[PDB]
Design a protein around this motif. Structure first.
Motif, mmCIF file in Angstrom:
data_model
loop_
_atom_site.group_PDB
_atom_site.id
_atom_site.type_symbol
_atom_site.label_atom_id
_atom_site.label_comp_id
_atom_site.label_asym_id
_atom_site.label_seq_id
_atom_site.Cartn_x
_atom_site.Cartn_y
_atom_site.Cartn_z
ATOM 1 N N UNK A 1 0.852 -1.221 0.000
ATOM 2 C CA UNK A 1 0.000 0.000 0.000
ATOM 3 C C UNK A 1 0.871 1.248 0.000
ATOM 4 N N UNK A 25 -1.424 -0.928 -4.580
ATOM 5 C CA UNK A 25 -1.366 -1.970 -3.577
ATOM 6 C C UNK A 25 -2.647 -2.225 -2.814
ATOM 7 N N UNK A 26 -3.743 -1.553 -3.157
ATOM 8 C CA UNK A 26 -5.017 -1.807 -2.500
ATOM 9 C C UNK A 26 -6.145 -1.393 -3.431
ATOM 10 N N UNK A 27 -7.349 -1.860 -3.106
ATOM 11 C CA UNK A 27 -8.538 -1.574 -3.906
ATOM 12 C C UNK A 27 -8.918 -0.111 -3.721
ATOM 13 N N UNK A 31 -12.213 1.755 -1.131
ATOM 14 C CA UNK A 31 -11.884 2.692 -0.068
ATOM 15 C C UNK A 31 -12.408 4.088 -0.379
ATOM 16 N N UNK A 52 -16.597 5.847 -1.348
ATOM 17 C CA UNK A 52 -16.455 4.852 -2.400
ATOM 18 C C UNK A 52 -17.642 4.937 -3.350
ATOM 19 N N UNK A 53 -17.353 5.072 -4.642
ATOM 20 C CA UNK A 53 -18.387 5.193 -5.646
ATOM 21 C C UNK A 53 -18.893 6.601 -5.878
ATOM 22 N N UNK A 97 -6.865 7.203 3.472
ATOM 23 C CA UNK A 97 -7.818 6.204 3.015
ATOM 24 C C UNK A 97 -8.645 5.739 4.204
ATOM 25 N N UNK A 99 -11.916 2.977 4.845
ATOM 26 C CA UNK A 99 -12.991 2.036 4.551
ATOM 27 C C UNK A 99 -13.861 1.932 5.795
ATOM 28 N N UNK B 127 -4.417 -6.237 4.135
ATOM 29 C CA UNK B 127 -4.011 -4.840 4.041
ATOM 30 C C UNK B 127 -4.599 -4.185 2.800
ATOM 31 N N UNK B 128 -4.709 -4.943 1.707
ATOM 32 C CA UNK B 128 -5.250 -4.400 0.467
ATOM 33 C C UNK B 128 -6.742 -4.114 0.568
ATOM 34 N N UNK B 129 -7.417 -4.653 1.583
ATOM 35 C CA UNK B 129 -8.812 -4.357 1.824
ATOM 36 C C UNK B 129 -9.799 -5.167 1.014
ATOM 37 N N UNK B 130 -9.332 -6.054 0.142
ATOM 38 C CA UNK B 130 -10.199 -6.907 -0.659
ATOM 39 C C UNK B 130 -10.046 -8.348 -0.194
ATOM 40 N N UNK E 12 -23.973 2.813 2.951
ATOM 41 C CA UNK E 12 -23.677 3.065 1.542
ATOM 42 C C UNK E 12 -22.907 1.902 0.927
ATOM 43 N N UNK E 13 -21.951 1.345 1.671
ATOM 44 C CA UNK E 13 -21.242 0.162 1.191
ATOM 45 C C UNK E 13 -22.210 -0.997 0.975
ATOM 46 N N UNK E 16 -23.994 -0.437 -2.240
ATOM 47 C CA UNK E 16 -23.132 -0.798 -3.363
ATOM 48 C C UNK E 16 -23.093 -2.309 -3.560
#
Ligand SMILES: CC[C@H]1OC(=O)[C@H](C)[C@@H](O[C@H]2C[C@@](C)(OC)[C@@H](O)[C@H](C)O2)[C@H](C)[C@@H](O[C@@H]2O[C@H](C)C[C@H](N(C)C)[C@H]2O)[C@](C)(O)C[C@@H](C)CN(C)[C@H](C)[C@@H](O)[C@]1(C)O
Ligand SMILES: CC(C)CCC[C@@H](C)[C@H]1CC[C@H]2[C@@H]3CC=C4C[C@@H](O)CC[C@]4(C)[C@H]3CC[C@]12C
Ligand SMILES: CC(C)CCC[C@@H](C)[C@H]1CC[C@H]2[C@@H]3CC=C4C[C@@H](O)CC[C@]4(C)[C@H]3CC[C@]12C
Lengths: 233, 338, 58, 285, 235
Positions: A1, A25-27, A31, A52-53, A97, A99, B127-130, E12-13, E16
């Motif tokens: 990340x 390194x991350x989605x 996030x 997000x979105x 970031x 989430x 860590x990547x969140x997915x 909201x998540x 989605x």
């Protein structure tokens, strides 16, 4: 990340410059993104937030309207178009970031920061009276903060975040909600509180602890920080 | 020699039967006759969880009583926040057919299995969140019917090849193999201490296994049909079993024989899942008639019926705190009752 | 051969099944009843709890 | 009334029999839909909606019989009249629109290829059912005020007069009744063509029976709705008291046929399906 | 109202995720699912290989005919017992049962297997498409006059070719009689006890035939047409 930022230089009042923020390194899509400014010899302030979105976008009162936030998921990048620049806007801007889900760790990764050299209301007020708290290695340290409004909610969570910014380094998350240690944080750090006054305790002081500790609230989206207490070696 | 072996096995079976008959000095019905009736245990659908596209097939509560993980044949694992009914995670699955799901006690991993013969362990703290497929453990030559987490590293699975396997998730090899069942091992239940567990298979049999030793300590053959569900009593000294015979049965490990049969003339279908309340006095059983039944464990009387389902109830699970129960049906709805 | 080997596995497993201590059914029933009575208050399903305590529906 | 009693009493008999048959059939259909959840499929939702519509109509029969027997006492209240010649007309329009929706649904289900088959959602069904019932209660709105007026209001004046459009409104009443001609030709063109197209697809065990049922349905639709709209127009042109007598006769015949419509619609659309017959037998048993 | 900032973000998540679920729902309801069952000697592998030239368990095979997407699921590694894992395969559009018409020795077991599939509690509603593979081998065996069907099946001595059946061009009467008798053997079981909720569509196919996909498409079209005729109160 890693979130690397670019697009900040010498600008004059009234100009319009765009900051770009590239993630790897991350989605990026999942996030949400936040922009945080550190004015020189000053505390942290929140600039803008994009969910997000792009289903929820918010801005701070000071830059209400003037600054815009937009994300380009296919390119995995985020933007910030500035308008009507002022001498107060000079600062180092970082990307954070966040989430948001049950058991998440928002405001987890912070970006290095782009320097910019140009030329309130019903918002929780966070106070950290102690400007400097000198302590020696091996001794325990305590940092106290407060809020005008109670940070506890019917859901039962205290929305308090403890961050630490080290000398010449970007800020990191220590505690995300008043009791929980973020990933990669030594167990020495611990947090407690009641709803109006909160304490962050470091069991034993080391050389990578020195820095300015900040407390932030998240009950209302006009997210506010504190002057920050500096720990000396 | 072979005839001698068969005759000796018959003699040993006769000895075990004689010991079991000798141990039976009193019956629970007689013992608990004076116990007060449980009353009419009526429940209501507090929350209805929607979003699945196909028949829900598996469910499992975490250590905390706020998160559920449900599996659907459409190929999705959905993690729901029961208190607010929010889809925290939506993990796609390579194999659409999913028949078992698990939630680690720490909550850092979720397992998924089925006809693919591969147990997929997914990591939610990346860590990547997915969510990613942290491990894909293969080796079983039959469909996986159940999988439960002992710890983050060790996971026990039961396959359709009439065997169970203890998997070290990091190494991804069968550390220990449990064999001896004559049919598919449909149901698995771990003891509270995790040192012992019980596996019920399609040969009308249940077996008590020790994780370390690797032997089936006790065998139970009370049912007349395939065993489709098994659950552990909260104390750890008994387990309830639901089979295709349409009757639930209580088997205590200490005495090594059945202790009660729950059956009603109005029910003729099989039992999909079985669970116990915190005290163990309310046996919750899901049935193919689209209805669920709450029996009294100590007296064998129907305390209640949960009829708020439109298709086969496939999954049933009581919270760790015991405040609510969760039922998943082939109607694609996961409903919370209390 | 293999048949006799499987048979000798079955016999030995039955033998391991037969050398185990067995308590009286009355003792097992008493233990179960005592466990349920002791923790009867704990279970919200058997013992309905006030609305505030339960998370769902207030 | 301007009828021989020897000819009026028989119409009362037939009307009461049709009332009983239609009401029984439609309450049975509604109860079957409500009692069992398995019956709430896409088509059966429209079927139950138009059963509600039908029943609201057949509940208007007693007042029609009263007006048949009572020439011009009309002792009941005025707004009772107005709601009576408004809910009836709205339910009629709703029934016709729901029949058109059913024909469209069947054509899409059977004729369309698997490549382009519609992803039917309970949302669009529960949407069109509540949009179509509005295009009906708003398209019957003109009757709400146009007519329903006791044109004429002394013991001799106690008789007063009955509901009918005073000459002024009649200017726009005619204007409205001619627009309603649309409601005849929009379903008729659909049912005649769409089902016919379906008829070809199924005519390209039970397929012949299905085609027979479709043909019977369209023919019943014709002989039951053409009369109505034929006599509504014969009525808006009547200026001869003698041929106005003929108009009264033409429309006593049309009304009994329209209540047939109401009573046979449940039979035609529900009794032919195996699911509904099984539900009825289960309810009886 | 009462919800806090992070609660709204989580909501909201969830919205989605629900949008993604609806996106997947469209495709899931569009796709047509098929269960490919067949004996080891039966040429299911040949058909599977033909399709995609247009300790693993389920083997999928996706193809498209007239823009219709067909997933075909094959069960290879599951244990011999079938009573349990058939449950997961209900709600499938069709069960493609492939039977070896060349080998009459194992045709009795094939009939028993087809009967088990037909009379299953969980598959009563679903339809079965019967593909009798290796028609060329059937013709070779019949016209080599060395293997007699009467030996394995007694009633074949009494059976007579149905006049209703249409013989194929360039086909000897013996091949026609044998193939149609083998078809009737399955059709007799299918018709009896079916009750009309599921129908069988026997088809005579060969090893490397190219019409298998279109035959499957037509059978699926018929099955869906009947399903609609019931679900739309047309029957
Ligand atoms: C001069 C007063 C007359 O009263 C009217 O003018 C009414 C408002 C008239 O209604 C007027 C006005 C209007 C708009 O219908 C409400 C028009 O469509 C018909 C032809 O005439 C009624 C309601 C019509 O009955 C309605 O006929 C509609 C076509 C269908 C509707 N449905 C809800 C079942 C039904 O109630 C009907 C067809 O006349 C009923 C018929 C069986 C009995 N008549 C023979 C009587 C004796 C009447 O002639 C009357 C009392 O002498
Ligand atoms: C497109 C797929 C989902 C099928 C649904 C088609 C729907 C939306 C359309 C097709 C034709 C439409 C009809 C066309 C004409 C009329 C007459 C008017 O008074 C409005 C209602 C009514 C009766 C419409 C109802 C909605 C309708 C049936
Ligand atoms: C003027 C007066 C007499 C007319 C009243 C008509 C009433 C009965 C109508 C108007 C709107 C209708 C609803 C519209 C839509 C639906 C959705 C469907 O899935 C079930 C029926 C249901 C819920 C209908 C029930 C009947 C309803 C309430």
């Amino acid at each position: 990340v890693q979130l690397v930022e670019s697009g900040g230089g010498l600008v004059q009042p009234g100009g319009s410059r765009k900051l770009s923020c590239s993630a790897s390194g991350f989605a990026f899509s999942s996030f949400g993104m936040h922009w945080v400014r550190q004015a020189p010899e000053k505390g942290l302030e929140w600039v803008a937030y994009i969910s997000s979105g792009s289903g929820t976008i918010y801005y701070a009162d000071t830059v209400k309207g003037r600054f815009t936030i937009s994300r380009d998921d296919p390119k995995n990048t985020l933007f910030l178009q500035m308008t009507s620049l002022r001498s107060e806007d000079t600062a180092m801007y970082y990307c954070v970031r966040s989430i948001y889900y049950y058991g998440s760790s928002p405001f987890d990764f912070w970006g290095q920061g782009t320097t910019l050299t140009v030329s309130g209301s019903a918002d929780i007020v966070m106070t950290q009276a102690t400007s400097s708290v000198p302590v020696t290695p091996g001794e325990s340290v305590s940092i106290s903060c407060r809020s005008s409004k109670s940070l506890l909610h019917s859901n039962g969570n205290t929305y308090l975040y403890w961050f630490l910014q080290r000398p010449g380094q970007s800020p990191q998350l220590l505690i995300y909600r008043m009791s929980n240690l973020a990933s990669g944080v030594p167990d020495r750090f611990s947090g407690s509180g009641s709803g109006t006054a909160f304490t962050l305790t470091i069991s034993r002081l080391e050389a990578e602890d020195v820095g300015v500790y900040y407390c932030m609230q998240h009950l209302e989206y006009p997210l506010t920080f504190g002057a920050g207490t500096k720990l000396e070696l | 020699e072979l005839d001698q072996l068969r005759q000796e096995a018959e003699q040993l079976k006769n000895q075990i039967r004689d010991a079991r008959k000798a141990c039976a000095d009193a019956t629970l019905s007689q013992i608990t006759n004076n116990i007060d009736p449980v009353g009419r245990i009526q429940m209501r659908t507090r929350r209805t969880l929607r979003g699945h596209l196909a028949k829900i097939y598996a469910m499992h509560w975490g250590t905390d009583s706020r998160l559920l993980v449900s599996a659907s044949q459409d190929g999705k694992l959905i993690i729901w926040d029961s208190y607010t009914t929010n889809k925290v995670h939506a993990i796609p699955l390579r194999s659409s057919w999913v028949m078992t799901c698990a939630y680690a006690p720490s909550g850092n991993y979720v397992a998924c299995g089925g006809l693919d013969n591969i147990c997929s362990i997914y990591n939610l703290k990346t860590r990547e969140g997915n969510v990613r497929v942290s491990r894909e453990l293969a080796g079983h030559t039959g469909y996986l019917s159940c999988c439960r987490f002992l710890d983050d590293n060790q996971i026990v699975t039961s396959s359709g090849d009439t065997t169970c396997a203890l998997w070290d998730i990091e190494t991804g090899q069968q550390t220990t193999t449990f064999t001896g069942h004559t049919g598919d091992v449909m149901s698995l239940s771990l003891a509270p201490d995790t040192r012992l567990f019980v596996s019920g298979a399609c040969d009308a049999s249940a077996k008590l296994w020790d994780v370390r030793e690797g032997m089936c300590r006790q065998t139970f053959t009370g049912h007349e049909s395939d065993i489709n569900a098994i659950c552990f009593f909260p104390n750890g000294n008994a387990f309830a079993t639901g089979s295709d015979d349409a009757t639930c049965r209580l088997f205590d490990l200490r005495a090594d024989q059945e202790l009660m049969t729950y059956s009603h003339d109005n029910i003729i279908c099989g039992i999909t899942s079985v669970s116990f309340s915190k005290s163990g006095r309310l046996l919750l059983a899901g049935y193919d008639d689209f209805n669920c039944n709450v029996w009294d464990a100590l007296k064998a009387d129907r305390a209640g019926v949960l009829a708020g389902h439109d298709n086969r109830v496939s999954c049933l699970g009581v919270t760790d705190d015991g405040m609510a129960v969760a039922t998943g049906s082939w109607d694609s709805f996961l409903k919370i009752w209390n | 051969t293999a048949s006799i080997a499987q048979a000798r596995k079955l016999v030995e497993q039955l033998k391991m099944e037969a050398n185990i201590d067995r308590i009286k059914v009355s003792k097992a029933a008493a233990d179960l009843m005592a466990y349920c009575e002791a923790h009867a208050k704990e279970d919200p399903l058997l013992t309905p709890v006030p609305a505030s305590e339960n998370p769902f529906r207030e | 009334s301007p009828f021989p009693l020897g000819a009026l009493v028989p119409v009362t008999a037939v009307c009461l029999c049709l009332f009983v048959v239609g009401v029984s059939g439609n309450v049975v259909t509604v109860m079957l839909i409500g009692r069992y959840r398995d019956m709430r499929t896409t088509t059966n939702l429209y079927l139950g909606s138009m059963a509600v519509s039908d029943l609201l109509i057949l509940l208007g029969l007693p007042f029609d019989l009263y007006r048949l027997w009572r020439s011009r006492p009309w002792v009941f209240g005025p707004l009772l009249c107005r709601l009576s010649l408004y809910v009836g007309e709205g339910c009629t329009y709703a029934t016709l629109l729901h029949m058109t929706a059913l024909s469209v649904e069947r054509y899409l289900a059977i004729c369309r290829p698997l490549r382009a088959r519609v992803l039917v959602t309970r949302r669009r069904v529960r949407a069109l059912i509540a949009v179509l019932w509005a295009v009906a209660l708003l398209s019957a709105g003109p009757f709400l005020f146009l007519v329903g007026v006791e044109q004429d209001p002394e013991a001799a004046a106690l008789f007063s007069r009955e509901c009918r459009p005073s000459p002024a409104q009649l200017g726009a009443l005619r204007v409205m009744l001619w627009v309603t001609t649309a409601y005849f030709f929009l379903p008729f063109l659909c049912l005649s063509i769409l089902y016919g197209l379906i008829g070809r697809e199924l005519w390209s065990r039970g397929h012949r029976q299905t085609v027979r049922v479709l043909l019977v349905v369209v023919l019943a639709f014709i002989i039951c709705w053409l009369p109505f709209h034929v006599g509504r127009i014969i009525y808006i042109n009547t200026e001869d008291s003698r041929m106005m007598y003929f108009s009264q006769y033409f429309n006593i015949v049309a009304l009994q046929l329209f209540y047939l419509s109401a009573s046979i619609n449940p039979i035609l659309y529900n009794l032919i399906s195996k699911k509904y017959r099984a539900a009825a037998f289960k309810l009886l048993l | 109202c009462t919800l806090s900032a992070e609660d709204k973000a989580a909501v909201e998540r969830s919205k989605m995720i629900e949008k993604q679920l609806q996106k997947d729902k469209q495709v899931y309801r569009r796709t047509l699912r098929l269960l490919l069952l067949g004996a080891d000697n039966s040429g299911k592998s040949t058909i599977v290989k033909q399709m995609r030239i247009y300790t693993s368990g389920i083997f999928e095979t996706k193809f498209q005919v007239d823009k219709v997407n067909f997933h075909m699921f094959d069960v290879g590694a599951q244990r011999d017992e079938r009573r349990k894992w058939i449950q997961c395969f209900n709600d499938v559009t069709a069960i493609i049962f492939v039977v070896d018409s060349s080998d009459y020795n194992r045709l009795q077991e094939a009939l028993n297997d087809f009967k088990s599939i037909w009379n299953n509690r969980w598959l009563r509603t679903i339809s079965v498409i019967l593909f009798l593979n290796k028609q060329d081998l059937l013709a070779e065996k019949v016209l080599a006059g060395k293997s007699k069907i009467e030996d394995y099946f007694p009633e074949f001595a009494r059976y007579t070719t149905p006049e209703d059946a249409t013989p194929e061009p360039g086909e000897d009467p013996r091949v026609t009689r044998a193939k149609y008798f083998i078809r009737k053997e399955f059709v007799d079981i299918s018709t009896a006890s079916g009750d009309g909720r599921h129908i069988c569509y026997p088809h005579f196919t060969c090893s490397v035939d190219t019409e298998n996909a279109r035959r499957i498409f037509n059978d699926c079209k018929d099955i869906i047409l009947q399903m609609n005729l019931r679900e739309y109160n047309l029957v």
